[PDB]
């Protein structure tokens, strides 16, 4: 009755989504083969797995997801592992030739022959669903197919469906730690498409996640599997109000009507707590008053942005576990008292709080330690204007002397489209400055 369809496009989305679908199976008690462990006995609460899975009629559960990519190696890993029996075989769409860090290839040359197959599958997925809340898309912007096919999908979905809310969990490049050499180009191009076609976008850069594992979890050599588990917990907490009863249930539709003051401003960054390992998480009581203090710690923000440089527009808090409503209210009063956190003038009240009864679920072989309480943050602040400013500066350095341009011009893209993307970010910067000033 309340369903969400998750789209995984690009290698970044697949691997992040790979850890997500391991967590949801654990949280609902579904084996990787798809069958429920204990037959059909009368102990099952329906409309709990209906958010993410679909009943096959007799036995197993089929997840509501589609895997989209232009390169075979990442998809074939899933089709060969132990999760081969879970997904629908014709929902893992794969191509032949990769985009190879080129935006023009994934949006003008190869993306045109794959979008038809993807949209056809989405139609079948939505037809089975009856109370579709919205869509979830995962993609790293700093890549070819992630930005190319990602832009095309939002453009096609915005006209095919219309008013359905879409949430984008994108991964922007870190300030100075980055893999590719030309990703500032196709990141700017990708930004223009998702600005006018998404309702909520979440900042999920990689450098901030490295710092969290170094300080809190005390992990000095983390691989990508460690990071993807952290994002997986955030998705679980956000959606936990759609399938578990609580004191203050908050749906998907009542997120982007409370975090979006103006239609253009929908870029916000997330935070999670407590994130602490099983060898020192067992000295502390982890009170609600102190876990909510760690949420506003600027070092715990999962985006490389300093919130102290900008005002807070609105914040969203989602507690799960055994929190008490008064204890939350007492903590919020202390936060407003603190002088280091300042809100915007025209937003007197700025907290939206939800409480759920189901505690977080720990994955065996993981790094986190399972606890009673957890809080997830989705905060919109004016400090986010700096991440686009530094990306614009990097673009200006290389586009001044036309580096790497001939790769884009030769694949059908016109020379001028680099210019139009510039004013879009420039206009976006002006809006953030305009909003932040007081009356």
């Amino acid at each position: 009755m309340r369903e969400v369809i998750s789209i995984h496009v690009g290698q970044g989305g697949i691997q992040v989504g790979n850890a997500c679908w391991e967590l949801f199976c654990l949280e609902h008690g579904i084996q990787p083969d798809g069958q429920m462990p204990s037959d059909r006995t009368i102990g099952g609460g329906d409309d709990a797995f209906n958010t993410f899975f679909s009943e096959t009629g007799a036995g197993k559960h089929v997840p509501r997801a589609v895997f989209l990519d232009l390169e075979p190696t990442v998809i074939d890993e899933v089709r060969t592992g132990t999760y081969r029996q879970l997904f629908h075989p014709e929902q893992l769409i794969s191509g032949k030739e990769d985009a190879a860090n080129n935006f023009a290839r994934g949006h003008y040359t190869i993306g045109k022959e794959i979008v038809d197959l993807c949209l056809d599958r989405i139609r079948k997925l939505a037809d089975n669903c009856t109370g579709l809340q919205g869509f979830l898309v995962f993609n790293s912007v700093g890549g070819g197919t992630g930005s190319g096919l990602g832009s095309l999908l939002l453009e096609r979905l915005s006209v095919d469906y219309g008013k359905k809310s879409k949430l984008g969990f994108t991964i922007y490049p870190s300030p100075q730690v980055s893999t590719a050499v030309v990703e500032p180009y196709n990141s700017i191009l990708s930004t223009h498409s998702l600005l006018e076609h998404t309702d909520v976008a979440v900042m999920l850069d990689n450098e901030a996640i490295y710092d969290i594992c170094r300080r809190n979890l005390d992990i000095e050599r983390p691989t990508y599997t460690n990071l993807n588990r952290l994002i997986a917990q955030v998705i679980s907490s956000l959606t936990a109000s759609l399938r578990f009863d609580g004191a203050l249930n908050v749906d998907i539709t009542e997120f982007q009507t409370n975090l979006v003051p103006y239609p253009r401003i929908h870029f916000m960054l997330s935070s999670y707590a407590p994130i602490i390992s099983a060898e020192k998480a067992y000295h502390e009581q982890l009170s609600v008053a102190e876990i909510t203090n760690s949420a506003f710690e600027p070092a715990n923000m999962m985006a490389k942005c300093d919130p102290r440089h900008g005002k807070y527009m609105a914040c969203s808090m989602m507690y799960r576990g055994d929190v008490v409503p008064k204890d939350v209210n007492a903590s919020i009063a202390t936060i407003k008292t603190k002088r280091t956190i300042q809100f915007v003038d025209w937003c007197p009240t700025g907290f939206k709080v939800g409480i759920n009864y189901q505690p977080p679920t720990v994955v065996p072989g993981g790094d986190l330690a399972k606890v009673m309480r957890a809080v997830c943050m989705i905060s919109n602040s004016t400090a986010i204007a700096e991440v686009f400013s530094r990306l614009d500066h990097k673009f200006d350095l290389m586009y001044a002397k036309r580096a790497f341009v001939h790769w884009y011009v030769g694949e059908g893209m016109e020379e001028g489209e680099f210019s139009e993307a510039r004013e879009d970010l420039a206009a976006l910067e002006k809006d953030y400055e305009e909003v932040g000033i007081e009356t």
Binding site: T73, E97, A100, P184, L397, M398, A400
Partner: protein
């Protein structure tokens, strides 16, 4: 999907090609009889990139052996792993190029290349989805340089959107064994810059330095030098055949390395390289590998990388390792040595991680770096050419086969033109 076809020409290229297929076969567990005897299922998932299926289930490489003299092909077929090659893919001349670029490109090469174009056409149309071509040849010999570079133009004319890759061995002034080397080297560079998508340069002088100084082995031979090149050759396509954290094919390397269309010459290197008596004293860790990676003495090229500035650089890691350590290591070297990196491009090093190392090694790295120091080879080669061409020495052989002195002037001007535009970015400021 995205398979590649291999072509080797000349005596130098054939020896390079012969050793390369020995490395690949052992990596995928292929016996000299063409039967698979590997251990892990990963050894067979991506075998279609280099191999074809035939009746009986045996595998044959899709390699074309092309030359003017049957003497060299009789030796390579007689070597171990020589029975894998298709006996119908052996196409050879009967006269010989005689180290004459005119002979290999106008008189004897032209009349023979018709036949070899059919077999390479057959191999290209048979594949599911072509990725690109790779060529191994030398720029000092006639058949390698002349008929080697003509095949590139014909193939590029028919397959424009593919990727052309060449592993080119240029001659060095120290170890020089052919007097007319400067002549046919200049004519090859002119033709190579127009069509080749990616080219890598190897120096026999540099390979000698690596063996004698680093490996500390007393008697290097041509089998040893061919072994070093072959290991680096498989590293480029290593991630195209095994799963990894950050998959990166040939096209991705092309996008991230070439800023301007005419600047596509690279120098390569391999790590780690440890002596037999000193391999129990080193510790294999990511900080250890990167220090040997950027070592000037480890380059397979005679150019000194500290005499210029790196435009772009790339490092391909093989083995199970943490991504953060790789990322923090690449940033540190770029900040500690900011003087040797060009400043109008941020984070000019690309990192890739693959989860399957070479056989016998827990960790290995292939380095492909675009640096402005390459201009030294072109300058010294041009210096040899201009002194020898002013007196018209050894010119009647080239002018005796329909090629006039106008073409020589065009090649010399083009080669100097490449250097001038290649050097101006070194002093370019933002």
């Amino acid at each position: 999907m995205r398979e590649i076809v291999h072509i080797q020409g000349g005596q130098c290229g054939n020896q390079i090609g012969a050793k390369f297929w020995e490395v690949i076969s052992d990596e995928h567990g292929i016996d000299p009889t063409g039967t698979y005897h590997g251990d892990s299922d990963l050894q067979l998932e991506r075998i279609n990139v280099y191999y074809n299926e035939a009746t009986g289930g045996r595998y044959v490489p899709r390699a074309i052996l092309m030359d003017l003299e049957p003497g060299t092909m009789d030796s390579v077929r007689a070597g171990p792993f020589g029975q894998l090659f298709r006996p119908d893919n052996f196409v050879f001349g009967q006269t010989g190029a005689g180290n004459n670029w005119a002979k290999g490109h106008y008189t004897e090469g032209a009349e023979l290349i018709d036949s070899v174009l059919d077999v390479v056409r057959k191999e290209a149309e048979g594949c599911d989805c072509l990725q690109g071509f790779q060529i191994t040849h030398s720029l000092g010999g006639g058949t390698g340089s002349g008929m080697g570079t003509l095949l590139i133009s014909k193939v590029r004319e028919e397959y424009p959107d593919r990727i052309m890759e060449t592993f080119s061995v240029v001659p060095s002034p120290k170890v020089s064994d052919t007097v007319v080397e400067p002549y046919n080297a200049t004519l090859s560079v002119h033709q190579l810059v127009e069509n080749a998508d990616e080219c890598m340069v190897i120096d026999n002088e540099a390979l000698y330095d690596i063996c004698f100084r680093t490996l500390k082995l007393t008697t290097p031979t041509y089998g040893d030098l061919n072994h070093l090149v072959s290991a680096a050759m498989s590293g480029v396509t290593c991630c195209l055949r095994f799963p990894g954290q950050l998959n990166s094919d040939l096209r991705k390397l092309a996008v991230n390395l070439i800023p301007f269309p005419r600047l596509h010459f690279f120098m390569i290197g391999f790590a780690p390289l440890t002596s037999r008596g000193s391999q129990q004293y080193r510790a294999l860790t990511v900080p250890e590998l990167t220090q040997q990676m950027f070592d000037a003495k480890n380059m397979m090229c005679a150019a000194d990388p500290r005499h210029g500035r790196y435009l772009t650089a790339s490092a391909l890691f093989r083995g199970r390792m943490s991504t953060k350590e790789v990322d923090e290591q690449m940033l540190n070297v770029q900040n500690k040595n900011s003087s040797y990196f060009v400043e109008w491009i941020p984070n000019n090093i690309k990192s890739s991680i693959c989860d399957i190392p070479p056989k016998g090694l827990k960790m290995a790295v292939t380095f492909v770096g675009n640096s402005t120091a390459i201009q030294e080879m072109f300058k010294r080669v041009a210096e040899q050419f201009t002194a020898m061409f002013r007196r018209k020495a050894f010119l009647h052989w080239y002018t005796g086969e329909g090629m006039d002195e106008m073409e020589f002037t065009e090649a010399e001007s083009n080669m100097n033109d490449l250097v001038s535009e290649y050097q101006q970015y070194q002093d370019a400021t933002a």
